[PDB]
Design a binder for this molecule. Structure first.
Ligand SMILES: CCS(=O)(=O)N1CCC(NC(=O)c2n[nH]cc2NC(=O)c2c(F)ccc(C3CCN(C(=O)CC(=O)OC)CC3)c2F)CC1
Length: 298
């Protein structure tokens, strides 16, 4: 890659990292804009260039705006609108009190709007976690750091938290589905919904098999009765232990029956019965949705 394209930006602090990139807060010297940068070290793929170009076109109020794509030296920089906090820090700050139900409902509604938008363009997020959800003082929440169909970049050696990505993975992914669907995003968001309500991760596995078994112990070991074709999936084993399902009233107390009903549809095993983002927006849980503002300490 050529030189000098990033001289317009002044990095002000390192604010995060992930499998394939380091995140900075930065300022444009020309415009004064404050921005987030994702720095990807390269060893390029044109298919990935086109995927990122399409994401730059996918603009919605509940998707973090991708402002620019800049290649320089052995690096790819993605330039994003800046948001001051992510949902993980907000739940951590709210751990003693919990997030008020109206704000949980607003955040879930907004994220379903962003996903219904993406999914209508046949775009998957693939990597939805609390740290991918950015919030501002006005009460908005936004989807960030979409995963691509094929990754690229030199893995960041200083990043040690990839185990946390298991927690939000859909069972069809864990069972070896190669061409999974927008339903994986609904699963992840369901896990995040339960986490907002209970102030505890729903399925905090630490290996692919522990992740599957944690799902099975709560929702029951899946079989042909509830998921036709599951026993033929590439990583399905007849030797899986057979656990009975638990009740959702144990799983996310004290959530009301509207919320529990919606959560149960977001956590259906079969990606063909799992509720879509659009159908979820019509769920009776949202009959009284409002837009509260969070108390953010920046
Ligand atoms: C105390 C902190 S904070 O809450 O004060 N606050 C400080 C401000 C900060 N703002 C921004 O970052 C930001 N603003 N506009 C756009 C932004 N970022 C991104 O687009 C972006 C990105 F380009 C790449 C990766 C990530 C995330 C994805 C999820 N992650 C992982 O998968 C790795 C991991 O550990 O998984 C468990 C964590 C990193 C991004 F968000 C949020 C957190």
């Amino acid at each position: 890659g050529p030189l000098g394209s990033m001289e317009n930006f002044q990095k002000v602090e390192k604010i995060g990292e992930g499998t394939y990139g380091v995140v900075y807060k930065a300022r444009n010297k020309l415009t004064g804009e404050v921005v987030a940068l994702k720095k990807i070290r390269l060893d390029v793929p044109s298919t990935a260039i086109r995927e990122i170009s399409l994401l730059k076109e996918l603009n919605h109020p509940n998707i973090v705006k991708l402002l620019d794509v800049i290649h320089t030296e052995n690096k790819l920089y993605l330039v994003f609108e800046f948001l001051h906090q992510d949902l993980k820090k907000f739940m951590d700050a709210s751990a003693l009190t919990g997030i008020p139900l109206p704000l949980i409902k607003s955040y879930l509604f907004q994220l379903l709007q962003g996903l219904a938008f993406c999914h209508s363009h046949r775009v998957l997020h693939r990597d939805l976690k609390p740290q991918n959800l950015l919030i501002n003082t006005e009460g908005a929440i936004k989807l960030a750091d979409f995963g691509l169909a094929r990754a690229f970049g030199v893995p960041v050696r200083t990043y040690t938290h990839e185990v946390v990505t298991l927690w939000y993975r859909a069972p069809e992914i864990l069972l070896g589905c190669k061409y999974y669907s927008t339903a994986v995003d609904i699963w992840s968001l369901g896990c995040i919904f339960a986490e907002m309500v209970t102030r505890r991760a729903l399925f905090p596995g630490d290996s692919e098999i522990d992740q599957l078994f944690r799902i099975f112990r709560t929702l029951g070991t899946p079989d042909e009765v509830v998921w036709p074709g599951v026993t033929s999936m590439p990583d399905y084993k007849p030797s899986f232990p057979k656990w009975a399902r638990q009740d959702f009233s144990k799983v996310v107390p004290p959530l009301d029956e509207d919320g529990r009903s919606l959560l149960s549809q977001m956590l259906h095993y079969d990606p063909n019965k799992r509720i879509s983002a659009k159908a979820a927006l019509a769920h009776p849980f949202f009959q009284d949705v409002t837009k509260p503002v969070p108390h953010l300490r920046l």
